[PDB]
Amino acid sequence: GYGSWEIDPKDLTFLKELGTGVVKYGKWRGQYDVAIKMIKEGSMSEDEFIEEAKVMMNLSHEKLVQLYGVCTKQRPIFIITEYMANGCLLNYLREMRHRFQTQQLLEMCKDVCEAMEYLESKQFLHRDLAARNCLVNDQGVVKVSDFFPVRWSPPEVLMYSKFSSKSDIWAFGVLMWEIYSLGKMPYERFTNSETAEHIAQGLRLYRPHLASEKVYTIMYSCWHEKADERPTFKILLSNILDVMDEES
Ligand SMILES: CCN(CC)CCOc1ccc(Nc2ncc3cc(Oc4ccc(F)cc4)c(=O)n(C)c3n2)cc1
Numbered sequence: 001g002y003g004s005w006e007i008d009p010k011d012l013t014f015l016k017e018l019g020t021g022v023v024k025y026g027k028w029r030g031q032y033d034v035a036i037k038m039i040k041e042g043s044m045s046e047d048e049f050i051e052e053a054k055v056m057m058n059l060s061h062e063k064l065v066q067l068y069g070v071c072t073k074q075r076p077i078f079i080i081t082e083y084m085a086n087g088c089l090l091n092y093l094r095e096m097r098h099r100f101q102t103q104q105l106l107e108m109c110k111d112v113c114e115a116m117e118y119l120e121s122k123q124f125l126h127r128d129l130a131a132r133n134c135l136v137n138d139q140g141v142v143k144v145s146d147f148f149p150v151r152w153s154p155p156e157v158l159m160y161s162k163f164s165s166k167s168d169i170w171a172f173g174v175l176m177w178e179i180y181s182l183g184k185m186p187y188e189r190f191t192n193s194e195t196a197e198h199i200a201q202g203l204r205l206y207r208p209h210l211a212s213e214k215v216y217t218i219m220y221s222c223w224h225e226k227a228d229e230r231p232t233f234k235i236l237l238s239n240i241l242d243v244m245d246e247e248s
Contacts, residue, residue, distance in 0.1 A: 005057055007069030007080055012036060018087075025083060033083035036069060038076050049077065055147070063115035063184060065135055065145040078153045086136035086141065093131060093183030100140060102210055103248055105181035108179050109218075110240050111142035117171055117233035119147060120165055127163060128152070129171035131178040150192040151185070156227055166227035170235065173222025180215065214243045 007028070014036065016025040022038040039049070056067040069170070071078035086092055086099075100108075112134060119126060126133075126147045133146040156162040167245035174186050186205055187195040204223050207216040218239050224230045231239070 002053070002057070002070055002072065003069070005069050006073070007078070008070050009071045009074060009078060012071075012078070012080070015195070016071070018031075025238070027119050028068065028080065032068075033085070035081045035083050037079035037081070039079065041075055042100065043245065053079070055124075059119070060122065061104040061115055061118040063069040063111050063141070064118065064147070065143045082137075084135035085138035088132060089134035089142055090178070090183050092136045093179060094144055096136075097182060104140065105179050106208060106215065106240065107187065107243055107245070108142045109176050110237070112144055112172065112175060113233060113237045113240055115144040116168060117237050119144075120233045125163060125165070126168050128161075129168055129175055130173055131183060134175075148192075151187050151195050152224070153199075154227065155200050155225065156197065162227075164227060165232070166230045169222050169230045169236070171218040172233070174205070176215075176219040176222070177205045177208060180219075182210070184208075212247065214246065218243065 011029045012034070013027045013030065014024050015027065017023075017176065018025055018035060021040055021043065024036045024038065026034055026036050028034045053067075053070055055097060060066060065084065066082045068078065068080045068082060086096065094101075098232070112129075116126070116129070126144070128146060128149055129144070130149060130152050133144065134142050135145050136142055149159065152171040152174045154167050157167050157170075178184065187198070189200065202225065204220065207213075211219070213242075218236065221231050221239075
């Protein structure tokens with residue numbers, strides 16, 4: 001048993017499909033908006049499901065998509081999370097520009113940075129940080145979810161498979177760039193193969209027009225060739241707050 005995490009499936013009402021594992025929008029006990037993830041039989045393993053669910057049971061933060069419970073005494077198994085009304089951040093940046101101004105781009109960055117500082121403090125590596133893996137709620141708050149993506153990877157990952165806190169740092173820099181470019185694909189004119197070659201040669205993503213020099217300095221610091229020279233999420237958060245105060 002998963003203790004207080006076990007949800008009675010009778011308390012769920014299904015309303016709309018969100019993506020297809022099948023994810024749906026619904027309500028829990030007719031009061032709370034939820035997303036219901038229906039893991040289809042055959043995918044994953046005995047141990048694989050147990051790990052990932054318990055990962056979500058042990059991590060909790062205002063800027064991380066929150067697990068509400070699990071339905072495991074039946075097939076298919078349900079995962080129930082908080083509902084993020086505005087969907088995927090990547091689509092939001094591309095399709096919902098009428099809902100946010102330039103000043104709010106930095107706020108999106110801060111939201112993600114707070115999530116990552118928390119994960120960092122728990123010694124938990126995300127390993128796939130990108131706009132496509134963040135969600136946006138009804139108030140426009142960005143939250144990290146889902147805790148090969150060549151375009152989000154540092155040279156040591158691409159060359160040596162060296163994952164660390166510092167590869168998450170690199171990816172976060174790329175995410176800032178996604179936000180400030182309003183959802184452009186990083187290295188937009190290159191293939192993954194070309195991106196890898198260019199990164200290793202010291203090529204870096206250009207400053208998006210919407211990013212000030214100070215904002216660019218923040219994302220650029222994430223891309224130091226030397227992993228040990230990249231900041232921590234604690235440092236990035238302080239930097240972001242400093243720029244927020246100076247630019248508003
Ligand atoms: C107009 C077309 N529209 C159809 C209505 C397209 C869909 O637009 C939307 C609209 C709202 C959402 N919101 C939304 N909210 C919560 C979750 C939780 C999920 O499970 C997790 C599982 C693990 C985890 F770590 C975090 C969350 C998950 O998977 N997805 C997707 C979610 N999507 C997502 C997409």
